[PDB]
Swiss-Prot record, chains A, B:
It comes from Streptomyces carzinostaticus. The chain holds residues 36 to 146 of 147 of the full protein. Keywords: Antibiotic, Antimicrobial, Disulfide bond, DNA-binding, Signal. One of its GO terms (biological process) is defense response to bacterium. Belongs to the neocarzinostatin family. This is Neocarzinostatin.
Length: 111, 111
C-alpha cells in the first residue's frame, strides 16, 4: 500500500526545502503534494502557497520538491480560510493525496 | 443565480491586485479564488501560488484580494503539474469554486 517519506523530516524552519517521495501509488495518477496540520479531528489545514504535485510513475512511485514553513495561512480542503497555522505548536506534516483523497499516511514533521 | 465580478479585469500585468466579488452564493459556503486558464475545452490550469478563498456572508456574497500574474507554473484540478501557462495568448480568468466545483461563471481577464 502507499508509502511516503520526507527529507529532512526534522530540524527544519521557514523556507527549508525538503524531498517528498511516495510508493504504492497508482501509475500515471496525479497526487497532490502539500503540507498540512490536522486542525481538527480528521480535518486538515494546508498551505497552497508552496503547494506541489507529483504523478506516480509506472511502479506507482514518484517525487518532487516542497518548501516548508514554520507557520502558514491555513485553508481547509473545502475552501475555508482557517487563517494562520502553527508557530511550532500543533504538528504540521506533508500530505500526498489524489482527486479522491486516496493517499498514504501523513508523514508527521516538526519545527 | 450565482454571480461573479473582478476589478480590474482588463489592462493587467504581473503582480496586479484585483477585486473579485461573488453573489447568489450559498451562505457559509467556501469558494476557492484562483487565476486559471482553460488549457482545454473544460479543463483549467490554476496558479495555486496566489490563491484566495471567500466565505459567503448571509446573503450569498463576500469578497477578497487576489494578486494576478501574467504567466505562471500551472496545476490541473486533479493535481497534475500542467507547466507554464500563458504569456498573453490564452485567456486566463479568475475562478470562484467550492469543494463541489459549483460556483458562478469565470470572468474573463487580460494583461
Ligand atoms: C483534491 C482534494 C481537495 C483539494 C485539496 C487536496 C489536498 C491538497 C490541497 C491543499 C490545499 O491547501 C489546497 C486544496 C488541495 C489541492 C484534497 C485531497 C482530496 C480532495 O478531494 C476531495 O475530498 C473530494 C474528492 C473525492 O470525491 O474523493
Ligand atoms: C476542488 C477542485 C480541485 C482542487 C482545485 C479547485 C479549484 C482551485 C484550485 C486551484 C489550484 O491551483 C489548487 C487546486 C484547487 C484547490 C477545484 C474546484 C473543483 C475541484 O474538484 C473537486 O473537488 C470536485 C471533485 C469532482 O467534481 O469530482
Amino acid at each position: 500500500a502507499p508509502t511516503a517519506t520526507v527529507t529532512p523530516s526534522s530540524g527544519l524552519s521557514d523556507g527549508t526545502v525538503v524531498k517528498v517521495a511516495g510508493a504504492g501509488l497508482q501509475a500515471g495518477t496525479a497526487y497532490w503534494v502539500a503540507q498540512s496540520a490536522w486542525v481538527d479531528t480528521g480535518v486538515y489545514a494546508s498551505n497552497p502557497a508552496d503547494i506541489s504535485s507529483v504523478t506516480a510513475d509506472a511502479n506507482g512511485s514518484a517525487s518532487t520538491s516542497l518548501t516548508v514553513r514554520r507557520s502558514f495561512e491555513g485553508f481547509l480542503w473545502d475552501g475555508t480560510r482557517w487563517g494562520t497555522v502553527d508557530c511550532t505548536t500543533a504538528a504540521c506534516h506533508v500530505t500526498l493525496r489524489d482527486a479522491l483523497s486516496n493517499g498514504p499516511e501523513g508523514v508527521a514533521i516538526s519545527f
